[PDB]
Design a protein around this ligand. Structure first.
Ligand SMILES: Nc1nc2c(ncn2[C@@H]2O[C@H](COP(=O)(O)OP(=O)(O)OP(=O)(O)O)[C@@H](O)[C@H]2O)c(=O)[nH]1
Ligand SMILES: CN[C@@H]1CCc2c(ccc(O)c2O)[C@H]1O
Lengths: 233, 337, 286, 55
C-alpha cells in the first residue's frame, strides 16, 4: 500500500514541475520597473502617454514586455518596503523642475540622495525625468523670482561648453536647466563606484517619445551590466 | 490640559520606581552553577528547490510534516518535508507577499503583501482545486504578519500602526487595537490564544488582550526597529530581535528584561527569532548569510548554522522539536537536525 | 644521458599541471550550486577535454620520446594517435562556442534568455564532441590516414616505431576542421565585442566625463594571444611539411606539437578568474 | 488633540496599578521549567537514528 502511496505523490510532483518549467520562461522574459516620485511630480500625467494601494501597467515595445509598478506610500518618510525592490531593472524618478521656490526641490534632492546610498539598492540604476520644462522657462523668462535667492550657489555657475541647447531657446533657460541637472549629477557621481549610473532627461506632458527613451535606457543598462560582468568595461 | 499631561509623567515615574524596586538580582547571578550545553553542530538533512525568486515567510504545519512558503514570484507552495515532494502550487493575484500562515486544522492557508488585502484559500475543495475563499480589506498599509487564532477568526498586523481581529464568515473587523506609533512588523500568539504581543518599529513591544481589546503592558528595551518576536514555550516570557544585532529576553510578571544576547564580532541586523521545545536554545537568523544558536540561560553561543548563499529571511521550529527550517533569499529551503 | 634526465622532470611537471587545474575546476563546479550556470557548461566541457588529453596522450608521448622506442603494439599506436587527434580537435570548438555565447550575450541583451536554455547548451556540446570524433576515429580506425610512400610503409610494418605519416588530403581537411574554421569566427566576434565596448565607453565619457580602453584591450589581448601563439605555428607547418618535402625536421615538428600541448594548462587561468571562482577555491583545500 | 492626550493619561493610569514579582521568582520559574523539560527534545539531546524520520 505504501509503495502505491509513493506513486501518487510521484505523479503530482511531475505536473507541478512541468507547470513551473512552463512559467520559468515567462517570468524570465519580462522586465520590471519601479516608478517613484515626490508629490506634485507629474507621475499621474506621464503614465497616461504609456497607457495609450498598488497600481501596475503592462506594455510591449518591439516584442519586449515591460511591467511597471507604482506604490503610493503617501506621507511615509520612512520606507521599510523598499527592500523588496532590489531585483528590478531600473528605477524611474520623477521631479518637478519648476518647483524651485514653491523647499520642495531640496526635498527631492534629499530623497534622491537617500535612495542612492541605500544598502539594498547598491546595484540599481536610476532613470531621471526632469518634468515641467515649460513652466520653468516661463518662470525664468521675465520673472520676478530669482534662483540665486533660493539657491546661493547659482551665482558662480557658468554655461557648460559641451552643452547642446535646443534651437530657439534663450541662454538663461539653458543655464538654469543645466544647473538643475548638475545639482543631481553631482550626487549621482559622488559615490557611483562604477556599478550603477544615472540617465537625466528633459520631458514635458505633450512629448510622446518618452517610452522610446525608457526602452533605450533599459537596453543600455543591460549591455553595461553584461560588459562589466565579463571584465570588459 | 498640560497640567493633566504632567500627572501622566508623574505616573510614568511611579512605573519606573516600581520596576526598579523588584530588581533583586539579575538572571546571570541566579544561574551560574549550571553546566554549559557544549558544542552543538547541525547538518543539513533536506533541501527544497523550485522557487524562482526570494523567499519571505514560512510556517510549519500542525502535523509536523507539511509546511508552506511564499515567494515574490507570486506562488504559494505546500511541501512534504519527509519525502521532499510538492503537493500544491497556488498562483497569486498580487506578486508581492510578505507573510503566510497555516491553519491549525490543516484546512486553510492565508497570505498578504503590499496589496492591502489578506486572502484565505480553501485547501480541501470537493473538486480538489485550491480557490480564494474570502478577501479581507480595511487596512491602509501593507501587512506584516497574520496568524490563525482558530478556524473562523484571524488576527492581522499592518503598516498603519494598527492590529485588528477579523471574522472570516462576515469579513468585518471585530476589534481594532491602536496605540503604536511606528510600523508593526511582527506578532505571535500565546499557547492558549488568550493574549498576544506585537513588535513595533518605534522600539516598543506591547502586550494585548484579545477579548477585551486593550493594552496591558509596554516594554522599551531596544533602541532601533524590531523585526521578530516569539513566546517562550511556558507562556510567561518572550524574546525579540532588532537591527542593532542584539536579542533581549523580557518577562511579563517581572515587567522588565532579564538578559541580552550580543557579541562584539557581529554588527548586522536580525530577521527571525524562534525557540526550542524546552526553551533552552534560542535561534536567530542574521544578515551575515548564516544563523546562530544561543543559550537561553547563559547568553553564550553554542553553534553556527551556515550553508546559505544569501541572507536568511525566515525560521521555524516544528511542534515536536524534531527539526528546524530556514528560508533565505537564495530561493532555497533547508531542514536541519 | 644528462639531457634525457632533464627532459624528464619538465615533462613530469607539465603532466602534473595539466591534471591539477582541470580536476580542481571540475570539483569546484560540482561542489557548489551557485556556479551551475548555462555559460559554465562549456567551461566544464573544455575542462573534461583538457583533463582527458593530459591524462591520456601526454604521458605516453613522454615515455615514447624518452625511451626512443615504442614498446606497445600497432593497435595501441592507432588508439593513441586517434585519442590525440580527438582531444586536440575537441579543445578548440569549445572555445569557439564560448566566444559565440559571449557575442550573443553582449550584442543582443534582450534575446539572451530566449536563445540559450539549459537544453540548448546540452545539444551543442554533443554536436562539438560528435563532429570532432568523426575526424578523430573514422579515418584512423579505418585506414584512410595512411600514406603509400615507401618510408611510411617500413614504419607501418614494424611493431616498434609509431610515427605520424599522412597524405595531403587528411592533413588539409583535419587542419581546416580543427583550427582554421574556429579562427575567423573568433576574430570577427571579438572585433564586434571590442566595438561595443568602445561605444559604451564613449557614451559614458560624453554623459559624465567632466565630474570624474585598457581593461577590454588587456582582456581581449590575453585571450586571443595565448591561443594564437600556442596553436598557430603548428597548424601552419602541418601544411608546410606536406606541401613540399625536406623542409622541416621531425625535431621541429615534435617541438611545435608539444608547445601546442601547453595551451591545455592555461585555460583554467583564463576562464576561471571570476571572484566567485576565487571564493570557491578559498573555501575548499585552503 | 486634547482629547487624545486625556485618553493617553487614562491609559497610563490603567496600567500603573499592576502587582509585580521580584526577579528571583521569575528566574526560578524559568530555570525549573528548563530543567524539567530538558529530556524531551531532539535538538539539545541527539537521540538515536532509529527514531529519526529525516536522516
Ligand atoms: N506644461 C506642463 N504641465 C504639466 C506637466 N506635468 C504636469 N503639469 C500640470 O501640472 C498640474 C498638476 O499635475 P498633474 O498632471 O495633475 O500631475 P500630479 O498631480 O503632479 O501627479 P502625481 O505626481 O502623480 O501626484 C496640471 O495642471 C498639469 O497639466 C508637464 O510636464 N508640462
Ligand atoms: C600525432 N599528433 C597529431 C598529428 C596531426 C594532427 C594533430 C592534431 C590535429 C590535426 O588535425 C592533425 O592532423 C596532432 O595532434
Amino acid at each position: 500500500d505504501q509503495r502505491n502511496e509513493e506513486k501518487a505523490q510521484r505523479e503530482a510532483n511531475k505536473k507541478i514541475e512541468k507547470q513551473l518549467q512552463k512559467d520559468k520562461q515567462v517570468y524570465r522574459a519580462t522586465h520590471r520597473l519601479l516608478l517613484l516620485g515626490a508629490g506634485e511630480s507629474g507621475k499621474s500625467t506621464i503614465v497616461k502617454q504609456m497607457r495609450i494601494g498598488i497600481f501596475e501597467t503592462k506594455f510591449q515595445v518591439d516584442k519586449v514586455n515591460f511591467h511597471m509598478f507604482d506604490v503610493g506610500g503617501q506621507r511615509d518618510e520612512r520606507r521599510k518596503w523598499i527592500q523588496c525592490f532590489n531585483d528590478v531593472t531600473a528605477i524611474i524618478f520623477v521631479v518637478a523642475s519648476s518647483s524651485y521656490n514653491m523647499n520642495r526641490l531640496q526635498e527631492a534632492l534629499n530623497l534622491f540622495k537617500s535612495i542612492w546610498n541605500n544598502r539594498w539598492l547598491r546595484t540599481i540604476s536610476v532613470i531621471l525625468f526632469l518634468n515641467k520644462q515649460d513652466l520653468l522657462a516661463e518662470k525664468v523668462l521675465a520673472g520676478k523670482s530669482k534662483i540665486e535667492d533660493y539657491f546661493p550657489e547659482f551665482a558662480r555657475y557658468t554655461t557648460p561648453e559641451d552643452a547642446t541647447p535646443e534651437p530657439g531657446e534663450d541662454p538663461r533657460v539653458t543655464r538654469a536647466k543645466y544647473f538643475i541637472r548638475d545639482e543631481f549629477l553631482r550626487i549621482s557621481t559622488a559615490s557611483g563606484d562604477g556599478r550603477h549610473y544615472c540617465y537625466p532627461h528633459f520631458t514635458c506632458a505633450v512629448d510622446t517619445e518618452n517610452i522610446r527613451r525608457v526602452f533605450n535606457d533599459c537596453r543600455d543598462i543591460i549591455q553595461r551590466m553584461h560588459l562589466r560582468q565579463y571584465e570588459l568595461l | 490640559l498640560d497640567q493633566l499631561r504632567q500627572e501622566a509623567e508623574q505616573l510614568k515615574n511611579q512605573i519606573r520606581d516600581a520596576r526598579k524596586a523588584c530588581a533583586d538580582a539579575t538572571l546571570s547571578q541566579i544561574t551560574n552553577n549550571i553546566d554549559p550545553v557544549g558544542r552543538i553542530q547541525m547538518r543539513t538533512r533536506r533541501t527544497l528547490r523550485g522557487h524562482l525568486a526570494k523567499i519571505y515567510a514560512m510556517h510549519w504545519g500542525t502535523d509536523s510534516r507539511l509546511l508552506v512558503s511564499a515567494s515574490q514570484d507570486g506562488k504559494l507552495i505546500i511541501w512534504d518535508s519527509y519525502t521532499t515532494n510538492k503537493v500544491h502550487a497556488i498562483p497569486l493575484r498580487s506578486s508581492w507577499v510578505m507573510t503566510c500562515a497555516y491553519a491549525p486544522s490543516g484546512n486553510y492557508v492565508a497570505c498578504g503583501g503590499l496589496d492591502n488585502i489578506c486572502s484565505i484559500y480553501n485547501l480541501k475543495t470537493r473538486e480538489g482545486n485550491v480557490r480564494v475563499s474570502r478577501e479581507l480589506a480595511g487596512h491602509t498599509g501593507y501587512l506584516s504578519c497574520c496568524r490563525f487564532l482558530d478556524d473562523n477568526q484571524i488576527v492581522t498586523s499592518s503598516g498603519d500602526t494598527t492590529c485588528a481581529l477579523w471574522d472570516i464568515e462576515t469579513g468585518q473587523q471585530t476589534t481594532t487595537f491602536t496605540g503604536h506609533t511606528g510600523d508593526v512588523m511582527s506578532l505571535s500568539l500565546a499557547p492558549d490564544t488568550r493574549l498576544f504581543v506585537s513588535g513595533a518599529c518605534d522600539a516598543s513591544a506591547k502586550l494585548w488582550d484579545v477579548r477585551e481589546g486593550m493594552c496591558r503592558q509596554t516594554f522599551t528595551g531596544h533602541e532601533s526597529d524590531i523585526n521578530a518576536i516569539c513566546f517562550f514555550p511556558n507562556g510567561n516570557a518572550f524574546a525579540t530581535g532588532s537591527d542593532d544585532a542584539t536579542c533581549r529576553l523580557f518577562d511579563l510578571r517581572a515587567d522588565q528584561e532579564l538578559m541580552t544576547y550580543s557579541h562584539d564580532n557581529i554588527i548586522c541586523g536580525i530577521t527571525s527569532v524562534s525557540f526550542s521545545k524546552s526553551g533552552r536554545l534560542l535561534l536567530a537568523g542574521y544578515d551575515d548569510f548564516n544563523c546562530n544558536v544561543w543559550d537561553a540561560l547563559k547568553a553564550d553561543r553554542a553553534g553556527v548554522l551556515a550553508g546559505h548563499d544569501n541572507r536568511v529571511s525566515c525560521l521555524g521550529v516544528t511542534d515536536d522539536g524534531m527539526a528546524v527550517a530556514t528560508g533565505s533569499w537564495d530561493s532555497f529551503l533547508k531542514i536541519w537536525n | 644521458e644528462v639531457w634525457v634526465v632533464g627532459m624528464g622532470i619538465v615533462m613530469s611537471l607539465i603532466v602534473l599541471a595539466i591534471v591539477f587545474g582541470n580536476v580542481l575546476v571540475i570539483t569546484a563546479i560540482a561542489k557548489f550550486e551557485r556556479l551551475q550556470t548555462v555559460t559554465n557548461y562549456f567551461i566544464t566541457s573544455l575542462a573534461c577535454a583538457d583533463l582527458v588529453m593530459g591524462l591520456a596522450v601526454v604521458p605516453f608521448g613522454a615515455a615514447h620520446i624518452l625511451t626512443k622506442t615504442w614498446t606497445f603494439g600497432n593497435f595501441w599506436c592507432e588508439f593513441w594517435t586517434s585519442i590525440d587527434v580527438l582531444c586536440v580537435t575537441a579543445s578548440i570548438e569549445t572555445l569557439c562556442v564560448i566566444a559565440v555565447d559571449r557575442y550573443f550575450a553582449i550584442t543582443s541583451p534582450f534575446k539572451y534568455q530566449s536563445l540559450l536554455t539549459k537544453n540548448k547548451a546540452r545539444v551543442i556540446i554533443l554536436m562539438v564532441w560528435i563532429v570532432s570524433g568523426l575526424t578523430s576515429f573514422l579515418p584512423i580506425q579505418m585506414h584512410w590516414y595512411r600514406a603509400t610512400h615507401q618510408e611510411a610503409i617500413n614504419c607501418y610494418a614494424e611493431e616498434t616505431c609509431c610515427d605520424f605519416f599522412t597524405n595531403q588530403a587528411y592533413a588539409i581537411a583535419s587542419s581546416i576542421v580543427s583550427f582554421y574554421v574556429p579562427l575567423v569566427i573568433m576574430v570577427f566576434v571579438y572585433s564586434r565585442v571590442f566595438q561595443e565596448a568602445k561605444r559604451q565607453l564613449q557614451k559614458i565619457d560624453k554623459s559624465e566625463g567632466r565630474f570624474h580602453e585598457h581593461k577590454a584591450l588587456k582582456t581581449l589581448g590575453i585571450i586571443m594571444g595565448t591561443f594564437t601563439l600556442c596553436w598557430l605555428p603548428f597548424f601552419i607547418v602541418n601544411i608546410v611539411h606536406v606541401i613540399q618535402d625536406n623542409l622541416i625536421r621531425k625535431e621541429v615538428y615534435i617541438l611545435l606539437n608539444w608547445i601546442g600541448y601547453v595551451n591545455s594548462g592555461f585555460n583554467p587561468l583564463i576562464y576561471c578568474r571570476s571572484p566567485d571562482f576565487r571564493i570557491a577555491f578559498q573555501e575548499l583545500l585552503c | 488633540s486634547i482629547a487624545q492626550a486625556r485618553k493617553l493619561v487614562e491609559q497610563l493610569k490603567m496600567e500603573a496599578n499592576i502587582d509585580r514579582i521580584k526577579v528571583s521568582k521569575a528566574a526560578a520559574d524559568l530555570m525549573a521549567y528548563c530543567e524539567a523539560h530538558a529530556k524531551e527534545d531532539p535538538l539539545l539531546t541527539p537521540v538515536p537514528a532509529s527514531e529519526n524520520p529525516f536522516r
